[PDB]
């Protein structure tokens, strides 16, 4: 009765009664084939946007292959010439002014095209992040086929809840449909558990596939899956070299995405910014 | 003995013959260092594109740090002045026209540059999605080191196929090379199994690490891993409080990426679109 707790005293629940359970779950293993109509994504039906977006190249083919994972008389002469010179100048200014309006309208269409390609790239990245989570989910379904359907699992709370009996799997659209049979604990005994016990302060023991439960102020052993206290023997314990606990701290890992450097906009632009103030010539 | 099936009747295969297996497996745990030459990715060797891409800033440094995870005299005087005025006008129109051609060429280069930066961003998101899938594969290799190489797994069909014996691991380029030894079932007995049995409708039982197999029209027990029917005793069953099945359904989850609804292009563009029409002055 000189057994002493090793590792502390913890109140935990040990099953005392069970019922047969049937859990039915779907696990996704694939996705529909997804491609992007980049012209329809960015422009819709607007023909000016699509016409300007043609000049952006075949990036949709590249995106979609990523998604699918494959003295007086002379004055009259001067008046005649001035009419032609001013006719050619006025005509030239119109051609200049028409090309300036075209450039400004195309620049504004480019900005909305470019902004909607940033939204497009965010969606392609989201599609790629979902298809990665589907691949993670497809691996979880294959682990349950191997360990729940093609065999019986000793893992508790893996093929549903409780202790595995038998599993069935059926094809379902974009995944697999599992039917699990278990006996699940419906009632628990809140028991006083020590991780190990020290004998006489010299020799420590650990419960072999079970718990050390203090019942009626004496330390007894019970199986972990069912509350049935029983005397501590050599068949249900493991001998520890010492009854001192070896404490360990696993590394602390938190995913924190780092913000990019991205220098000041004006300072970076000033390396090449040609801000000119063009001045028209003075013509008499 | 009035033992009724609980949960239905299912035909499943229980091993009856095994052979020793050797499975050799590669699991990738890392990738080679990948960076992007964005000037070469977008422009290739085209120097007119690489000159214009310099003005796009240091986005490659940002992208690559993400990838690596760190009243006759007067008339002659007028003719002299008119020759200079038309000389200055013609010179100015030429400078304007040269800057109009430059602006149109640069705009067309910016459209192919922007389209190829959208294909660049798709590749970066694909490379970041393979980066997470390799990390997922690196965690699966560390689970096999901990549970197959540094210990013996009680999980069937985990360290290869069948029942684990011993595993070995070697370093392979960008991964770990596993060698699994196990006894895999080569022949099966198709047995009629009930997940549990009910006795007189009062108390149900569940098989403890095994199967309830109906053989010769009497309900028997067998271990799950090997087909050896035996009488149902209290050592190989778990008593259920009731023989009614507790049916549950896990929530249905399908990854269906939401489409990023964008406004009508023309309606959004019309908030700021300046579709001016410029008319040259009338000059007689």
């Amino acid at each position: 009765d000189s057994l002493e707790p090793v590792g502390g005293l913890y109140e935990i629940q040990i099953p005392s009664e069970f019922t047969i359970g049937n859990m039915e779950e779907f696990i996704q293993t694939s996705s529909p084939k997804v491609t992007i109509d980049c012209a329809a994504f960015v422009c819709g039906d607007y023909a000016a946007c699509k016409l300007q977006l043609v000049e952006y190249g075949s990036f949709c083919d590249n995106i979609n292959a990523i998604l699918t994972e494959v003295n007086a008389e002379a004055l009259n002469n001067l008046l005649q010439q001035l009419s032609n010179r001013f006719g050619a100048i006025s005509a030239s200014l119109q051609e200049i002014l028409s090309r300036l309006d075209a450039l400004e309208a195309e620049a504004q269409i480019d900005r909305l095209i470019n902004g909607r390609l940033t939204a497009l790239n965010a969606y392609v990245s989201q599609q790629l992040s979902d298809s990665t989570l589907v691949k993670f989910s497809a691996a979880q379904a294959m682990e349950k086929v191997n360990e729940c359907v093609k065999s019986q699992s000793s893992r508790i709370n893996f093929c549903g809840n409780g202790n595995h009996i038998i599993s069935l799997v059926q094809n379902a659209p974009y995944g697999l449909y599992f039917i699990h049979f278990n006996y699940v604990p419906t009632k628990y005994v809140t028991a006083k558990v020590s991780p190990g016990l020290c004998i006489a302060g010299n020799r420590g023991i650990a419960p072999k596939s079970g718990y050390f439960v203090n019942v009626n102020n004496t330390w007894m052993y019970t199986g972990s899956g069912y509350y049935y206290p029983e005397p501590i023997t050599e068949n249900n314990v493991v001998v520890m070299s010492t009854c001192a606990v070896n404490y360990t701290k696993a590394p602390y890992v938190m995913l924190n995405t780092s913000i990019p450097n991205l220098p000041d906009f004006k300072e970076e632009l000033d390396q090449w910014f040609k801000n000119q103030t063009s001045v028209a010539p003075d013509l008499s | 003995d009035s033992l009724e099936p609980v949960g239905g009747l299912y035909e499943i295969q229980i091993p009856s013959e095994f052979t020793i297996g050797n499975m050799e497996e590669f699991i990738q745990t890392s990738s080679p260092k990948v960076t992007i030459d964005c000037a070469a990715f977008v422009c290739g060797d085209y120097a007119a594109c690489k000159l214009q891409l310099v003005e796009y800033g240091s986005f490659c440094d940002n992208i690559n740090a993400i990838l690596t995870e760190v009243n006759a005299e007067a008339l002659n005087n007028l003719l002299q002045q008119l020759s200079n005025r038309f000389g200055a006008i013609s010179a100015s129109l030429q400078e304007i026209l040269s800057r109009l051609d430059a602006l149109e060429a640069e705009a067309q280069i910016d459209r192919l540059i922007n389209g190829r930066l959208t294909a660049l961003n798709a590749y970066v998101s694909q490379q970041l999605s393979d980066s997470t899938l390799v990390k997922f594969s690196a965690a699966q290799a560390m689970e096999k080191v901990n549970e197959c190489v540094k210990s013996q797994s009680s999980r069937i069909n985990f360290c290869g196929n069948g029942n684990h014996i011993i595993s070995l691991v070697q370093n392979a380029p960008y991964g770990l090379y596993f060698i699994h030894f196990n006894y895999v079932p080569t022949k099966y007995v198709t047995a009629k199994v009930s997940p549990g049995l009910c006795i007189a409708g009062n108390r149900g039982i569940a098989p403890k690490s095994g199967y309830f197999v109906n053989v010769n029209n009497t309900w028997m027990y067998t271990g799950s891993g090997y087909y050896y029917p035996e009488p149902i005793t209290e050592n190989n069953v778990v008593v259920m409080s009731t023989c009614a099945v507790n049916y549950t359904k896990a929530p249905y989850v399908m990854l269906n990426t939401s489409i990023p609804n964008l406004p009508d292009f023309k309606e959004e563009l019309d908030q700021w679109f300046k579709n001016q029409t410029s008319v040259a002055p009338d000059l007689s």
Partner: antibody
Framework: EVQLVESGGGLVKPGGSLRLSCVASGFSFSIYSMNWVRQAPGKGLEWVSYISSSSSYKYYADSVKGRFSVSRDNAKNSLYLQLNGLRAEDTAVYYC??????????????????WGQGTTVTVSA | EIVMTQSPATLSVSPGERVTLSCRASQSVRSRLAWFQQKPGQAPRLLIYDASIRATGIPARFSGSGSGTEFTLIISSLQSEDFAVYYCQQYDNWPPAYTFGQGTKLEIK
């Protein structure tokens, strides 16, 4: 209900031209991708052309590349195929079918569920 | 070019008999495989898509399975109206380059 109707088929001398039309009805044609598939006399199905809902991405089988042109008019819910430079091998029954859903430029694929009844192109001398 | 091969091109079957139609792709098309049925003088009818998903209204007796380069269409309880020509079609990669199998004819027996 939801159906596709082909027209514009008939006898055509070799090297001639035909204009097949596939007017859609019953579904949102403006967002679906469409295909042309031809069936030669007593032979399997051959995919001719694919056109996207925005008409920007058109694809052709190599056997018809250059000589065949696909077009659509989502306002008229109709699909067209220009059969230029018709040869002997182009004698077939030409089908149109839906391919991709594409509700907002994002296409999902569920098979060519809807087909047209076809039209017959006979190219002989 | 992914070539789709169906063998045998002909099958003699009787009503109530299980029929398996095999399809093979020269390259892995993953799960982008569809099954079509073409009764004489009629357009093809989509039966299975994604190699295993029945199209709407398709009877439960038509079952699809497989992935990669081996695909199968199962007609569990063949009926008198199932005597038709059956094709497989692949739509795996981008751009669209769709190739059908040469068909399999179910002859009455």
């Amino acid at each position: 209900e939801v159906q596709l109707v082909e027209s514009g088929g008939g006898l055509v001398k070799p090297g001639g031209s035909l204009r097949l039309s596939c007017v859609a009805s019953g579904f949102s044609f403006s967002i679906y991708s469409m295909n042309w598939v031809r069936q030669a006399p007593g032979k399997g199905l051959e995919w001719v052309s694919y056109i996207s809902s925005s008409s920007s991405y058109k694809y052709y089988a190599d056997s018809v590349k250059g000589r065949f042109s696909v077009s659509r008019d989502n306002a008229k819910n109709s699909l067209y195929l220009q059969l230029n430079g018709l040869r002997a091998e182009d004698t077939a029954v030409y089908y149109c079918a839906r391919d991709g859903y594409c509700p907002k430029g994002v296409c999902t694929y569920y098979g060519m569920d809807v087909w047209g009844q076809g039209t017959t192109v006979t190219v002989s001398a | 070019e992914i070539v789709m091969t169906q063998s045998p091109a002909t099958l003699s079957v009787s009503p109530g008999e299980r029929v398996t139609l095999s399809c093979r792709a020269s390259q892995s098309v993953r799960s982008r495989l569809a099954w079509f049925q073409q009764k004489p003088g009629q357009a093809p009818r989509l039966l299975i898509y994604d190699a295993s998903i029945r199209a709407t209204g398709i009877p439960a007796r038509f079952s699809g399975s497989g992935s990669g380069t081996e695909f199968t269409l199962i007609i569990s309880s063949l009926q008198s109206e199932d005597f038709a020509v059956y094709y497989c079609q692949q739509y795996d990669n981008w751009p669209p380059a769709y190739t059908f199998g040469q068909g399999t004819k179910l002859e009455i027996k």
